[PDB]
Amino acid sequence: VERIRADRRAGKISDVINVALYEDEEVKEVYINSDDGRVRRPLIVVENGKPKLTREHVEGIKNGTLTWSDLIRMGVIEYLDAEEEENAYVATWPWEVTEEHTHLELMPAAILGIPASLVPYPEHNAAPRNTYGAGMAKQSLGLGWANFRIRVDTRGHLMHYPQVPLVNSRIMKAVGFEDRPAGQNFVVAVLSYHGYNMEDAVIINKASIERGLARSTFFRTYEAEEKRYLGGQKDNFEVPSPNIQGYLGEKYYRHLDEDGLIFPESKVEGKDVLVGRTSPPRFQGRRETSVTVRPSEKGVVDKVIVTETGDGTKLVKVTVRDLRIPELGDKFASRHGQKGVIGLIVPQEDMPWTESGIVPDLIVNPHGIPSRMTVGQLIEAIGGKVASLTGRRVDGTAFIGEPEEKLRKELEELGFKHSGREIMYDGITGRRLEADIFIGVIYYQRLHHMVADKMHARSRGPVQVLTKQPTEGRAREGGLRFGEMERDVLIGHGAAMLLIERLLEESDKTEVWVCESCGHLALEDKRRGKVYCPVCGEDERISKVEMSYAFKLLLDELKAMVIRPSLRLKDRV
């Protein structure tokens, strides 16, 4: 094992080979792995208490004369899989290495993933809070890609003024998050304000919103193809004539050009036609198959792309952009797992201000901070205030970040309180607040969970063909499901008439003819205007019974399963 390790360190053999030694009184085994799928990490080789990495190697790396592969080649740094690491003894820090140590950790902060490194000071937060912050880091909005306008993504978001965090880890610069930020720095004051920020809710300044803070644009791309059918039939890109079937209306084609394509920079609403298309009839005039905006969505047409598919058919892609000014119900989350929707938009005159002339952009309730054990948020606020005052960004890397006490000392030296508390005045009364309010700069991210895309209201509309029940989804104007648990609470409340109105009257109410002789479903003949039971007869004793259409479907399924349900009718009174 020692000879193989020495040969690998000398560069005689490849670095993919990993060797491990297993020693025991009963068994003695040596394992060598050189296959695929092994996840390894680099470690600095430590020999007799001295690491192999010296200052000369660092100088060569900085000067550019040495690369990482060169460092791997000399055996200074080696990749260790899980099997080889069983025999290793890694020191966490360079000043903690001894003669017993066999390896030295390169960067303890590198054990986290890319989204997990976005959180500043993760060691000062609870683990579930760090998990939530890592999860919500992928839901933020910002300048993700510079070529967003030419892309044809189905959904897209764009923050108008993205900002690099003032408190950020050094890994974020190397990863590339600083070039493509997804949030803004918010002046946040921890204060209870009129009960509108309780239960994780937040309060946002009206003037800040009107000045462009957290402004976002939502993109949606629609596509239309001039499909070709058998026999030479094909779709046509033109404004449909009023005489054709399926005509939506005159006002729905007001934005269409003579080629059937919508003009760019045209304001559109729900069910507005973007591409005018017609289709050949089935088994008459041509039908209408135009591509329209979603009923609950609106915006302005951004671009129109005219191209062809792989089969030569015409392809038209239309992108619609909608301005998303923050409002009530818009989800906002910090990097430390603190999330909540906007509870109230408060004018700047009513908002409190400090003795230095600082008005918070956001107000968070103090009740949410200590219960979740989030000290990293307070440290980030202090660091953001210090960075704004000094002009130098505060490093927030894990385990090597700027100490909290240093930030407090810098804040005290800058002329502010060490604790970050400032004297604030009430916006409405104008009097001094009895307590010094903690206020700082916290990086806040706007998430894609917007109330504009979540509000759904259905009264009546399309139903499923099979069950005669309301459809599913906001795009298809569907209804809300009244599940088994909802029926359970309705039963527990003792509301029988409410249950009848919900499950039967408003969902699938229908009437059927039931034969009173054999219990079979009678047949109504519209030709002769008579109702009779085909299996048994009984042209007279036929009664109409109302029930859910789902029950009729169940009866049909039971009959198809060679099961005869006999409905015994009873008088209402």
């Binding site: 025991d24 009963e26 068994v27 899980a82």
Partner: protein, 49 residues
């Protein structure tokens, strides 16, 4: 039975009917590991490792 033995019992040894000594030796190694774990000679294997 011959087809099942050739194409199902340790295919990574091979499907050629000649390659049966290797399958027998691998099964013997498996039995040795089982007996070592049962008699306390060796410890359990961590699946999550």
């Amino acid at each position: 039975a011959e087809h099942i033995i050739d194409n199902n019992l340790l295919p990574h040894m091979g499907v050629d009917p000649e390659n049966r000594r290797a399958k027998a030796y691998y099964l013997g190694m498996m039995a040795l590991k089982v007996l070592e774990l049962s008699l306390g000679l060796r410890g359990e294997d961590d699946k999550d490792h």
